[PDB]
Design a protein around this motif. Structure first.
Motif, mmCIF file in Angstrom:
data_model
loop_
_atom_site.group_PDB
_atom_site.id
_atom_site.type_symbol
_atom_site.label_atom_id
_atom_site.label_comp_id
_atom_site.label_asym_id
_atom_site.label_seq_id
_atom_site.Cartn_x
_atom_site.Cartn_y
_atom_site.Cartn_z
ATOM 1 N N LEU A 132 0.908 -1.309 0.016
ATOM 2 C CA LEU A 132 0.030 0.119 -0.020
ATOM 3 C C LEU A 132 0.795 1.302 0.155
ATOM 4 O O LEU A 132 1.841 1.083 0.554
ATOM 5 C CB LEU A 132 -0.886 0.191 1.266
ATOM 6 C CG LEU A 132 -2.187 -0.924 1.363
ATOM 7 C CD1 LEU A 132 -2.595 -0.731 2.715
ATOM 8 C CD2 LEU A 132 -3.156 -0.745 0.271
ATOM 9 N N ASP A 133 0.319 2.172 -0.501
ATOM 10 C CA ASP A 133 0.803 3.616 -0.594
ATOM 11 C C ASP A 133 0.841 4.115 0.874
ATOM 12 O O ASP A 133 0.043 3.710 1.610
ATOM 13 C CB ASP A 133 0.073 4.625 -1.532
ATOM 14 C CG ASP A 133 0.357 5.997 -1.505
ATOM 15 O OD1 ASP A 133 1.314 6.455 -2.288
ATOM 16 O OD2 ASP A 133 -0.438 6.426 -0.488
ATOM 17 N N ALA A 134 1.808 4.793 1.215
ATOM 18 C CA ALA A 134 2.186 5.391 2.697
ATOM 19 C C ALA A 134 0.855 6.044 3.010
ATOM 20 O O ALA A 134 0.459 5.612 4.208
ATOM 21 C CB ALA A 134 3.393 6.383 2.658
ATOM 22 N N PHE A 189 11.599 6.881 -0.247
ATOM 23 C CA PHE A 189 10.828 8.169 -0.633
ATOM 24 C C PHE A 189 10.469 8.396 -2.110
ATOM 25 O O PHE A 189 11.402 7.898 -2.919
ATOM 26 C CB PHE A 189 11.123 9.359 0.057
ATOM 27 C CG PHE A 189 12.688 9.761 -0.402
ATOM 28 C CD1 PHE A 189 13.846 9.348 0.080
ATOM 29 C CD2 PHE A 189 12.724 10.542 -1.597
ATOM 30 C CE1 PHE A 189 15.042 9.757 -0.349
ATOM 31 C CE2 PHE A 189 13.860 11.062 -2.031
ATOM 32 C CZ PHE A 189 15.127 10.555 -1.432
ATOM 33 N N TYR A 190 10.048 9.504 -2.404
ATOM 34 C CA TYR A 190 9.700 10.117 -3.719
ATOM 35 C C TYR A 190 8.987 11.232 -3.748
ATOM 36 O O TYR A 190 8.603 11.934 -2.580
ATOM 37 C CB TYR A 190 8.839 8.941 -4.638
ATOM 38 C CG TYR A 190 7.389 8.691 -4.173
ATOM 39 C CD1 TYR A 190 7.458 7.513 -3.087
ATOM 40 C CD2 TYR A 190 6.452 9.024 -4.514
ATOM 41 C CE1 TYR A 190 6.044 6.901 -2.760
ATOM 42 C CE2 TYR A 190 5.002 8.659 -4.166
ATOM 43 C CZ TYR A 190 4.961 7.317 -3.065
ATOM 44 O OH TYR A 190 3.646 6.938 -2.955
ATOM 45 N N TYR A 191 8.855 11.946 -4.727
ATOM 46 C CA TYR A 191 8.407 13.046 -5.096
ATOM 47 C C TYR A 191 7.314 13.222 -5.683
ATOM 48 O O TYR A 191 6.854 12.717 -6.701
ATOM 49 C CB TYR A 191 9.262 14.083 -5.813
ATOM 50 C CG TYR A 191 10.624 14.305 -5.085
ATOM 51 C CD1 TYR A 191 10.974 14.943 -3.912
ATOM 52 C CD2 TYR A 191 11.800 13.930 -5.826
ATOM 53 C CE1 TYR A 191 12.208 15.106 -3.299
ATOM 54 C CE2 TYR A 191 13.055 14.107 -5.188
ATOM 55 C CZ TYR A 191 13.218 14.755 -3.887
ATOM 56 O OH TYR A 191 14.329 14.924 -3.247
ATOM 57 N N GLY A 203 -6.976 9.374 -1.106
ATOM 58 C CA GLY A 203 -6.177 9.043 -0.078
ATOM 59 C C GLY A 203 -4.858 8.493 -0.226
ATOM 60 O O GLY A 203 -4.086 8.240 0.783
ATOM 61 N N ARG A 204 -4.214 8.501 -1.619
ATOM 62 C CA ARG A 204 -2.755 8.507 -1.836
ATOM 63 C C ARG A 204 -2.091 9.595 -1.517
ATOM 64 O O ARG A 204 -2.306 10.456 -2.036
ATOM 65 C CB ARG A 204 -2.834 7.505 -3.137
ATOM 66 C CG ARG A 204 -3.512 6.232 -3.246
ATOM 67 C CD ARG A 204 -3.262 5.379 -4.494
ATOM 68 N NE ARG A 204 -1.995 5.384 -5.212
ATOM 69 C CZ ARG A 204 -1.543 4.684 -5.927
ATOM 70 N NH1 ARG A 204 -2.318 4.169 -6.746
ATOM 71 N NH2 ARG A 204 -0.086 4.567 -6.174
ATOM 72 N N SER A 205 -0.810 9.225 -1.114
ATOM 73 C CA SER A 205 0.298 10.466 -0.880
ATOM 74 C C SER A 205 0.215 11.481 -2.109
ATOM 75 O O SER A 205 -0.151 12.676 -2.009
ATOM 76 C CB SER A 205 1.681 9.895 -0.829
ATOM 77 O OG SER A 205 1.711 8.944 0.050
ATOM 78 N N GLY A 262 -4.033 4.830 -10.720
ATOM 79 C CA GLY A 262 -2.712 4.817 -10.257
ATOM 80 C C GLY A 262 -1.759 5.934 -10.896
ATOM 81 O O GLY A 262 -2.161 6.754 -11.629
ATOM 82 N N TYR A 263 -0.563 5.885 -10.779
ATOM 83 C CA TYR A 263 0.513 6.898 -11.265
ATOM 84 C C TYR A 263 0.319 6.756 -12.669
ATOM 85 O O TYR A 263 -0.146 7.898 -13.205
ATOM 86 C CB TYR A 263 1.787 6.404 -10.847
ATOM 87 C CG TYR A 263 2.310 6.396 -9.537
ATOM 88 C CD1 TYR A 263 2.234 7.690 -8.638
ATOM 89 C CD2 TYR A 263 2.897 5.284 -8.724
ATOM 90 C CE1 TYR A 263 2.697 7.833 -7.160
ATOM 91 C CE2 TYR A 263 3.087 5.403 -7.423
ATOM 92 C CZ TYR A 263 2.956 6.707 -6.704
ATOM 93 O OH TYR A 263 3.346 6.536 -5.218
ATOM 94 N N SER A 264 0.486 5.525 -13.324
ATOM 95 C CA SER A 264 0.505 5.769 -14.789
ATOM 96 C C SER A 264 -1.063 6.041 -15.361
ATOM 97 O O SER A 264 -1.107 6.582 -16.719
ATOM 98 C CB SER A 264 1.075 4.448 -15.312
ATOM 99 O OG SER A 264 2.328 4.463 -15.069
ATOM 100 N N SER A 270 7.860 5.788 1.209
ATOM 101 C CA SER A 270 7.901 4.730 0.458
ATOM 102 C C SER A 270 6.259 4.096 0.600
ATOM 103 O O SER A 270 5.763 3.675 1.663
ATOM 104 C CB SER A 270 8.941 3.640 0.865
ATOM 105 O OG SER A 270 10.169 4.058 0.512
ATOM 106 N N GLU A 271 5.894 3.321 -0.410
ATOM 107 C CA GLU A 271 4.787 2.423 -0.414
ATOM 108 C C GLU A 271 5.471 1.121 0.245
ATOM 109 O O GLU A 271 6.631 0.844 0.065
ATOM 110 C CB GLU A 271 4.545 2.164 -1.805
ATOM 111 C CG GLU A 271 3.843 3.433 -2.614
ATOM 112 C CD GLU A 271 2.805 3.321 -3.449
ATOM 113 O OE1 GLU A 271 2.290 2.176 -3.652
ATOM 114 O OE2 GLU A 271 2.208 4.424 -3.745
ATOM 115 N N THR A 272 4.470 0.542 0.998
ATOM 116 C CA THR A 272 4.990 -0.757 1.846
ATOM 117 C C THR A 272 4.017 -1.855 1.845
ATOM 118 O O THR A 272 2.812 -1.552 1.598
ATOM 119 C CB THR A 272 5.697 -0.012 3.134
ATOM 120 O OG1 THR A 272 5.685 -1.319 4.068
ATOM 121 C CG2 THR A 272 4.400 0.781 3.723
HETATM 122 FE FE LIG Z 1 2.532 6.349 -3.891
#
Ligand SMILES: [Fe+3]
Length: 331
Positions: free
Chosen positions: A59-61, A91-93, A120-122, A184-186, A245-247
């Motif tokens: 899951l995303d943080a 981590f990421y931006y 609800g995702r970062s 998602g991201y993509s 990070s996602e974890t």
């Molecule tokens: Fe994420």
């Protein structure tokens, strides 16, 4: 010694099956194995794990926050790292990608159509909406409604399309799986590419993952917080925030975490970044970020003492908390 992995829908299901089958060929019979449990959304995976039907899910943080809450009470156990094995990044931006020449700046996002990785995702939600909600002269702070009204149509996967059809305007139904093309991201990126939304709240690696050529990527830009635009290559100085990070999460007790680590450790050992051609844990012909993020380069064991709040850190948890209550500076 079986870890029951929670795949969210078909594509993930398919990758999970290949993940199980390929591990069987490199792990001795007395080692950890993969059992595939398919669910409709990350939330169900959270509930399933808490109910002892599944054991793990990534899951995303931001969503780690949810999983923590009772009666779920899940905990981060193995985190993904990015960058390279030689320089791991936990981590990421969060960046706001836009098409070059669309002209608007960060301060001019009102009335635009937005593409979010997920509710609800970062990057796709917490960071952008966080920096946005309180500046709103409008006190329609129960978030979703306020956002639905701020933008002129969006795609916020996992948002309730019935109460807020505005939030699913770009992806009817706000599907909470990769079956929704804008998930998602993509997916959020495609939403911009296709021209369905004016901006995409994703991460610094997203464009690079979808556009192999600088020429094409040149037709995109990043919105910086000082209301100016920068090239997608310059996210370091043009990103909305740095996020955890996602974890992989598990039950706080009886979570089988140790077995999970082993499975994932041995997994990265045999099918990590560029290890094998027969199987890639970090990519798939079936889609992007299935089970784990394509951008991930490996896993790191989370220290035993860390609960979700210690993992997310004081500021992020507080931010997510205020976010969901609309708590704003002054009142
Ligand atoms: Fe994420």
């Amino acid at each position: 010694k079986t870890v029951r992995w929670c795949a969210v829908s078909e594509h993930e299901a398919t990758k999970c099956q290949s993940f199980r089958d390929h591990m069987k060929s490199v792990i001795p019979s007395d080692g950890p194995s993969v059992a595939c449990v398919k669910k409709a959304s990350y939330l169900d995976c959270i509930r399933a794990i808490a109910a002892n039907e599944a054991d793990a899910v990534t899951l995303d943080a931001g969503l780690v926050y949810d999983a923590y809450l009772a009666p779920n009470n899940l905990k981060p156990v193995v985190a993904e790292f990015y960058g390279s094995k030689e320089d791991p990044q936990t981590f990421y931006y969060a960046v706001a990608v836009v098409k070059k020449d669309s002209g608007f700046q960060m301060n001019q996002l009102r009335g635009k159509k937005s593409c979010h990785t997920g509710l609800g995702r970062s990057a796709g939600w917490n960071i952008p909406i966080g920096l946005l909600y309180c500046d709103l002269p409008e006190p329609r702070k129960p978030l979703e409604k306020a956002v639905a009204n701020f933008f002129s149509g969006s795609c916020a996967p996992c948002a309730d399309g019935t109460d807020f059809p505005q939030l699913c305007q770009l992806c009817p139904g706000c599907g909470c799986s990769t079956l929704n093309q804008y998930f998602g991201y993509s997916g959020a990126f495609k939403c911009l590419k296709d021209g369905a939304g004016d901006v995409a709240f994703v991460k610094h690696s997203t464009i690079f993952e979808n556009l192999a050529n600088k020429a094409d990527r040149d037709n995109y830009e990043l919105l910086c917080l000082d209301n100016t635009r920068k090239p997608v290559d310059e996210y370091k100085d043009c990103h909305l925030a740095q996020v955890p990070s996602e974890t992989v999460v598990a039950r706080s007790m009886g979570g089988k975490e140790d077995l999970i680590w082993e499975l994932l450790n041995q997994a990265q050992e045999h099918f990590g970044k560029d290890k094998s051609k027969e199987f890639q844990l970090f990519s798939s012909p079936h889609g992007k970020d299935l089970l784990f993020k394509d951008s991930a380069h490996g896993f790191l064991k989370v220290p035993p003492r860390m609960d979700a709040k210690m993992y997310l850190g004081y500021e992020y948890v507080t931010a997510i908390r205020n976010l969901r209550e609309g708590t704003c500076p002054e009142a």
